[model samples]
Target chain A: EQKTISISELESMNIKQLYEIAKSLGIPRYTSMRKRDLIFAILKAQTESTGYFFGEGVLEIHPEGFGFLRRIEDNLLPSNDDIYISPSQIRKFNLNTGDIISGVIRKPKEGEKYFAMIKIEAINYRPVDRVNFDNLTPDYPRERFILETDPKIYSTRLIDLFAPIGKGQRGMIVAPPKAGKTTILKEIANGIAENHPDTIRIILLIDERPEEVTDIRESTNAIVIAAPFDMPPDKQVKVAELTLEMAKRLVEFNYDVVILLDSLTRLARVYNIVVPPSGKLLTGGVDPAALYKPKRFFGAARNTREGGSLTIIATALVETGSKMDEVIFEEFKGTGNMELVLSRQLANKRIFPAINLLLSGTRREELLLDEETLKKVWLLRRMLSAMTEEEGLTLILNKLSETSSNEEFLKLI
Target chain B: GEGVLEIHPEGFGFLRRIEDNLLPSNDDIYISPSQIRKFNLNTGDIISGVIAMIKIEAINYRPRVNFDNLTPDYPRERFILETDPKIYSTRLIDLFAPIGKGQRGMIVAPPKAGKTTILKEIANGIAENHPDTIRIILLIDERPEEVTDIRESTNAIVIAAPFDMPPDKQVKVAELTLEMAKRLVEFNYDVVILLDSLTRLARVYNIVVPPSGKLLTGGVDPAALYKPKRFFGAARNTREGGSLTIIATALVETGSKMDEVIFEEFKGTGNMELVLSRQLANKRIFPAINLLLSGTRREELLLDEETLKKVWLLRRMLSAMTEEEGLTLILNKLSETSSNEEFLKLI
Candidate 1:
């Protein structure tokens, strides 16, 4: 019923193709799995097939919630037939458009149209999934990183000289309405688009209000995919789902990438709607839905990879008009290593950036700056935090006392 | 070929024969007696339980309810009705959208636009005027207070609210209500099923996401959780059984554009849509229906020329009357006109 590949054919094939087949047939050992064994297994899998020809194809998904496994090499259907797949299968497998798919096909039921698959297989080549990162690679020499976008924009300067973000770093920009979360992201987009044309930006907007896309794109010219206001939860998820796939695929190819998820809070809202409420949140933890999933999405961003790096800047909006949804705030706080808090109080002032330095941080602080700069920035942050608690009166008292430290601080500012 | 969902009213139920399409003509599955309470079944009413390790042996198909499983063949003949519910036209609905015995019906309106009130009045009108018809009201997604008002004002069963008795239980309650509806027909009761609103049950539902990557619509959509199609399809003139009429309300918010889009998608499933307006309610109009929005796909067989033209004229006049100037003053002027036939010449 099936024609099998010869050992000569398998030996000549590249490691990726060989690995693809081994992965499809459940063969493991990423590094040591021999090409010869992979070829023999593929032949065995073919020989075991009871009907039709042994074949491999690419899985292409349809919006109506099904997909087809077509020939990867020629883009023609593998048997000129589109295999039927349910959404549960597609989502369960995380099937991508060009991913290698191999499986035994069974004829459709008496009334069904497309052929169904069994003992099905789906594989993705990316190895990096998630980790609490102190470094992208082990024992790599510490590298010098500079923050240059909008250095003259006052707030940007303070942000750079103190809490700086390097390329591929995951930064959380969070605030309530009028607190400049979007404004800051927009400014970053605008600044980066003009300054770094070589950088690739993908903006994933969740339940976006109509103007948000135009607002960001017109300024920054970034690629925007949105779950516009009032979109069905299912469709909204599909939008983010597809965009993440695209961005991840782009990053896999070693492209310099920047992914901005406009609001992880909105994404959660979409999920919360689609996902059944698992009852009350953990006694001391968070909503069950918020547990590890957000981490997975934010964790996917890595500046440390063999090919290229990806920077993720996502905003976790507070729920309703409150400080934040208790569950959401806890989940994001626990997961994200770096946070840039946009203060509503400072926003009430004429502060454009309104970053609350006390609540913000960068986990990779030591690597981003030299010792001397770190000393200055550390003093500045501590003094600023003290001023915030004292309602900025500490500086006034120092000025009243005529302390040289106050005079010197004015000069430093 | 023979199977019965044997239900006992004091409240226990089971499948009797599965030899054909069900589990096994050889075996049966014991269902929750709580279902008996919900389905309003009397133990004596069942014509088909448990004689422990006897139960766990079977698969409990909940929520899917196998609403999809029972395929009822619609082969009964229809007889026309005499009624006029629209203004200024005799055989009003008969001209616009006629409803027949054993036909499924729906009276739609926006929130607080008197969906329940109109529904209650329709039930009251039927029960008062036509004592022969048996109507069982099902209230869903309705506020607890509204359901109470329905009990006082008129009666209907459900919502999709007790509907949220934490969701899953709500679905169970609905399943039981339908079973009772089926029994009503089984016992030869020509019934009317009035469901307050099914939309509330249609909230942001949770779906299982695969452990990784992105979710793609691979061809299989989630089974319609609420299964309203099955609910409505059950409202039919059965081959030799009594008729069942269902008037279910689906609440769709119209404030946002996306709401309108989704509501538009919802607009197609039912036979006729009677879109009642908030404006008409505020104006103290009895039905508060917006003629422009209110229409039916069954007009061809239900409506014809002269009466159709009259409905067309009123809809046009009403549209014109709502602009720049309303009908209050114009209607008063018509009332004050001079000639013998001038009592009411709206032409």
Candidate 2:
């Protein structure tokens, strides 16, 4: 139905007069209407002064059929020709009558659904604007490995020893009793945490040792994942694997993750002892085969298709006995075939004799040139060259003692 | 071809002035060739000349005659020469004695004998008179406590070797001394290398002489590896442009083989001698030296007749006084020599 009225007739009416006018026009609930509400209703229903009411402080109509009216002042009405949207239409649009709404639908990536804002049905006077998204999403950068040695050259040399790992690459630390293995790891961790605080995600995987946890916490900023010491080896492995998987997920979500396994040697030993013979450890159970396999992880990149890389720093202990001999034999025998194949496939690397030096090798190059270090290694090899070479062993031991003393003196200042 | 003109003159006559030639005819007088040939003044001719006198004024006074003043110097006041007559007579004395480079001397005396006073006098005299004399090095290894007194007495530069240096370092000290001495010599300095006492150094180095009977009969270099090899090596004299004079003290034991050996070696070098009692006594010094043992090499070159006579007189006076005072004076002189002399003398 079409109805028209003059703006002067509406402006002359009082609040009661406006209500009577609204009631005469068959508007619902006119008597309960406030003065402003009565004025808006009369203006919205009128049609004669439509351009004046709608263009200037009256009802507004949107292309979506829903419309609303805005009262500009007390007791001032334009006309019945305004025909603007009602309060109910504004509510339906999920917007206030005065609000200006603008939006665009964003299409999701492959295998993802698209979503958009849809209920707004009205428009007000258009205003120019701009938006920025840089502050919205921040990137997590890659972690770095820091090295420290007494002679400073030691640190530099250790970095040389770990040259195969490349700078900023992940590696591990290993040592036996009194071998300064933990010290080496702590030095590296402290350096990384202090120097590369902004980029790297360091997760310290503490497998069931409280003391180890405390030591690592004291040394680095790696988020520690610790479990009970007595946890069954299979269960521990599961937890470790699960934690790594979660870390991997985070990396895929664009994070640089560094996983530090204090001693993989311990984990390997536990794995061998705990998994039952009947259990399919290699498949889903405590996997013996999986024990030797190197775990793979992802890294972050700018493109969504590319996943984040995971660098693991682990420790392994090699002893000096028949047990060590067997391990060596296994390591050597396995080298040309499955082990080599696995390493090539999963980045499995080993640094024996001294895990500290090996980890340093992953970072430094000058370690190879250290005369004392080379001499010590040469002596060790000579001692191990023949079991019956007692003289060689004695000489090597003496040399070791001398080297340590000399090193201590050199490091004194 | 000339005519002579004669004129009568008074008792003593003189020539008169003439127009062209004035005065006398003798003014133009000349000897003949024959006369010239007969007389000659040659290089070898011995001749006598007369003195020409000019008139001048002269004054004369009569002597005052007094019978009371006839006693002359026996009068209330008498004039005497305060300067040493010996010094005026001779230019050579202790001051002119040549001390060779790196060489040393010993001034031996008994206690209460003014050795310190003598050293002080010499130091002051050298500083006052020969201010430009070559640099002197006073080494006080043992008596560091006496350095203040010595410094107050002399202007000599001093270097003190460590008293507690290790036995091994003694060799180093000796080497350093040699080096410094050589440098001073090269610098053209007559260095006075003074070690107050050789006994202290010898004891520190464990240099001891065995009994005479045990002495090696074979011909071995005295400076070889003997009991006092280190001391001998350190003290050996080397000829240098600038000379070194070392004055040190040692206990004069009559029968001590070590003392005899030291004295013999010192004398053998033709560089050392004792300070004679005659010299000391003539100088009226308290520390009287023994003339029998006291000697000086090249003394003939260093001492003139006057100095020698003075020294001889001093010796005679000392001997006479010692003889008159009996053993008490001798003992007192020896004791006095033993203390101050031992401490003041540099070796």
Query: What tens digits encode model 1's per-residue C-alpha lDDT throughout B13-127?
Result: 6553312212123455455665444544342123222231133221221111122233344423322332233222112233344554566666665745667656666566566
All models: lDDT? 0.51, 0.36
- Model 1 chain A weakest 10-residue run by lDDT: A132-141
Candidate 1 displacement at residue B341 in angstroms: 99
Q: What 10-residue stretch in candidate 2 chain A is worst by lDDT?
A: A334-343
Model 1: per-residue lDDT, tens digit, A1-413?
A: 01112343455557866666566555446457465665666656645543322344446677786777654222232354656556777777666554445554554445564566654532432221322232233111123223345433444444555456666666788776677777667666655666565556667777877786667655555666565686677777766655555455555555556778888876766666676656533322234454334455665565654545567789877534542354466444423445787767766775556666666666656777776777766666656755672454234334324523322434554
TM-score, chain A, candidate 1: 0.60
Candidate 2 regions exceeding 4 Å error are A1-413, B1-104, B109-117, B135-141, B207-240, B253-270, B275-285, B291-293, B313-347
Per-model tally of clashing residue pairs: 29, 61
The lDDT, on a scale of 0 to 1, for candidate 2 is 0.36
Superposed on the true chain A, the predicted chain A of model 2 yields a TM-score of 0.40
State the TM-score for model 1: 0.36
Q: Score every model by TM-score.
A: 0.36, 0.26
